[PDB]
């Protein structure tokens, strides 16, 4: 056992090494994303740069988990990051509401993960996800659903107008 | 074919999703070795800094490769990140002999990238790779070559006090 | 022969003077565009704006040239610049359209001339066309590229406040 | 018609459109002068400075003239920019010669320009002509007879160190 | 073999180490025409002003080539650096154009170098040569050739004041 | 005879020019020290530093030397610099003492040539190596003394942690 290791269950070592690959995962979909709209043919610079943020958001989240991980005496394990579930995004709508499902799932796995913390008795695995993830996730999940949200409202994908002002108002 | 598509070769598209994705196998072992040095019986910052900054600037190389892609109308198709050979580094000198194998790989495939560019006298890509990857990574080599030296002569591994003073001192 | 000259050939030289002529007539056409957008019936300021910069780009790109060519020893012979082939660009989409053929044909002429320059083995030229021309020809075609697919997507010609729109916000 | 034509006769707008090619082949000459100065066997850089001044400042005349041609409602109809008449400029004397013929038929142009204004009784033209263009060519016309004088009495071209002299005080 | 050298050819390393006593070689040519310009019987301050510069700088390009050596794991043999030519240069005119000639036989080993280095498919070699040797060297041969030029056209040798004059305003 | 040489024997012209020549074989020998310790395999950063700087300082006294030889009315014959004795310094303790012993013939070489001066009854010449080469010379091998000393004591070579620390510390 680590030296420092204390009040740290092993299922919370493996349920924070999956959230580690699963903010990888997220941080590589964003990334995928970033690189659809960078493409001549979507040309959405200020999309490309949003989710950019959100890959590099993703990351800084993974490397905290990762500090978290060794602060607590556990051993990070990785695991191969599985590629996103397409690499053409077909719009910014799509890619948004893509991006609202990730978070969901991230969310998702973080509450699952409180929840075993919870189980475990272990307080600060537990502050430390509602501090620095959960609410974190819950604002990504607001601010994707508020994107979603004027993005049909304005008529995307079919406006074609409506991805270019969006891009440039919300986005820009 | 993409619009801005002109003497783009398949094969390089190919070969520049591989180099992408080899450099974000890059940065993800790098971020491996700083979790490893990050941990409470390893406990060496500076070393865990170096090799954090390695994946952020392994991560700043894919990032460009993917945005030298889009501007030449290849389309970026992302694979696994396949995890890091091991996730016990054993040593800071066994650590940088890692990250020395891992760069002059790296260098080899940009070295075979170049020739295949050559081959298909794609005069830009040739240049990119010369001006962005190939100086960085013989810089990169060079600098894990003397880290790697310097560690052997100070007594690394065996010397415990040799890690620890070149991480106050040739990484502080 | 000059006594600057070395490792010039006369092909080389004669490319080079084409492709002064081919860059100073991208300046011609571009300025064309330039005045076609300050017409009262076209309106388009930040059109006519982005085109007189990039006809003053082509013309640096010609001077750049033609200081080339007399470092390496080479007599700089200038043509008739061509008119361009049309007056009326008809459309900001069009003249965006126009000008990506344009930079894409420039672009080609930079790549034979580079392969020209290879087969003469003469790494001077080949290095300052890919330093200064080529990169800069793959932005200016991804950057036209991203013109035309937001002004297509945007309903552009058709779509009377698409132009009006990335006039003001890509142009602007 | 044009929505802001008024005053502003066909053959004022042919005469307009002449005088736009009349200053950009101005403009081609004087490039053509500052590369035959750029040369290793001339080596008159403040000759060639000069005359790459000149050749920016033809083309924002041609600028300005098409802005006018713009802003009266005519439209601006390009033709091929001819060479220049040679391309072995001699000398700077001889350059500076040139030049002075060059802007003296450049001011007769524009004389016969504002002679057609003002048969036409169109003062608006009248006044740009005279106010932009006439007195800019009187100062053109006597500095470059002043250039010239001053290179005859020192003895250009035959005294190899008037050119370079001149060169360093008065272009300098 | 090196732990950094990788795509490094032994005919690479000793073409880098000859042109390494061929820039010391420059530089000590530079220094003695500096020398002999800082004698009181000719007493040129610019003209041993610049080849001092000229000196300093061939001997910055010999330490670049020597990190370029260090840096591929190539090992650095110095060699006797020659005595220059002659000790006594004869004029400013003259000095000028031995070091033209001195600067066209650094740029041929130089693109021989580039050549050789082609020839094993050493694409860092290729672009250190380019980027930090084969422009300097046509810039430097240029000038000199500028040099040259100015100072037959003034009169020099045998106008005593055109070497004078050369040295206040094109050396000073 | 120059006009400016007064009290100033053959000898003593001779003497300077031989000095001259130790200098700058001082100053290959320091470069020589600095580029092995450049290399990957002993990487010593700060000693490579140091030994780049005693080259640049040995050129500065060479031509501080030549600046003497043409104030005196001497005319500067320089010689082929000879290869260092060596290109493996195999440490820095040894090329430490190298450098003592290298520094301790140039300051007898300068003795020598002080004694000559006085036999020649030349007070400026006396003054002049007294004022700018014995002191400097004695601070110097008084400095390397120090560093042998400290590096013998530290365990050099033997202790591998010896050379990196003095390197960090002392010459850092
Ligand atoms: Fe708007
Ligand atoms: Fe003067
Ligand atoms: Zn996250
Ligand atoms: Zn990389
Ligand atoms: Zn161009
Ligand atoms: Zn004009
Ligand atoms: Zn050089
Ligand atoms: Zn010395």
Chains 1, 2, 3, 4, 5, 6 share one sequence.
């Not at 990504?140 to 993005?151: Q, R």
């Amino acid at each position: 056992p680590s030296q420092v290791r204390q009040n740290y269950h092993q299922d919370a070592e493996a349920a924070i090494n999956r959230q580690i690959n699963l903010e990888l995962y997220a941080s590589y979909v964003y990334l995928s994303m970033s690189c659809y709209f960078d493409r001549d043919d979507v040309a959405l610079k200020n999309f490309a740069k949003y989710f950019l943020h959100q890959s590099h958001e993703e990351r800084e989240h993974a490397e905290k988990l990762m500090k978290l991980q060794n602060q607590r005496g556990g051993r990070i394990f990785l695991q191969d990051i599985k590629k996103p579930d397409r690499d053409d995004w077909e719009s910014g709508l799509n890619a948004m509401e893509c991006a609202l499902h990730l978070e969901k799932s991230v969310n998702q796995s973080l509450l699952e993960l409180h929840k075993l913390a919870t189980d475990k008795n272990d307080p600060h695995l537990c502050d430390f996800i509602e501090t620095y993830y959960l609410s974190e996730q819950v604002k990504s999940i607001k601010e994707l659903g508020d994107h979603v949200t004027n993005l049909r409202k304005m008529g995307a994908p079919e406006a074609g107008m409506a991805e270019y002002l969006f891009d440039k108002h919300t986005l820009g």
